Amino acid sequence: KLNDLCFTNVYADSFVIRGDEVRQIAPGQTGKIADYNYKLPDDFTGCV
Amino acid sequence: FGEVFNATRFASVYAWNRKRISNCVADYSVLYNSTSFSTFKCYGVSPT
Numbered sequence: 806k807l808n809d810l811c812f813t814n815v816y817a818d819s820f821v822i823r824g825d826e827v828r829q830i831a832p833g834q835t836g837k838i839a840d841y842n843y844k845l846p847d848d849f850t851g852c853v
Numbered sequence: 854f855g856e857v858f859n860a861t862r863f864a865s866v867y868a869w870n871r872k873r874i875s876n877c878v879a880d881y882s883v884l885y886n887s888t889s890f891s892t893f894k895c896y897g898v899s900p901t
């Protein structure tokens with residue numbers, strides 16, 4: 806549906822991590838990235 | 854966590870190993886610097 810929509814309050818976040826840690830960029834995750842570095846909301850709209 | 858995740862020799866999958874754990878605090882934040890995991894998935898409980 807991305808091609809048929811209009812988007813409000815768009816932001817882009819950028820960083821670099823280790824390959825093993827990519828699974829932690831998701832709602833409700835644990836680990837050091839998801840605890841001390843970068844946290845997503847439980848109710849998240851957007852793409853990773 | 855040190856003789857489970859940091860053992861010198863692991864078993865073969867056909868004769869897999871089983872170990873009892875009791876009477877200990879489960880503070881896993883000690884593995885944040887120790888051990889990078891490509892897979893970590895929990896069933897019946899939320900990681901948070």
Ligand SMILES: *[C@@H]1O[C@H](CO)[C@@H](O)[C@H](O)[C@H]1NC(C)=O
Pocket residue numbers: 886
């Ligand atoms: C993490 O582990 C590395 C490699 O052993 C070590 O150099 C570093 O000091 C450790 N960091 C701390 C303080 O936990």
Ligand SMILES: *[C@@H]1O[C@H](CO)[C@@H](O)[C@H](O)[C@H]1NC(C)=O
Pocket residue numbers: 855859887888
């Ligand atoms: C695992 O054991 C090795 C053996 O010397 C040690 O160098 C390493 O620091 C240990 N890693 C831990 C305890 O996280």
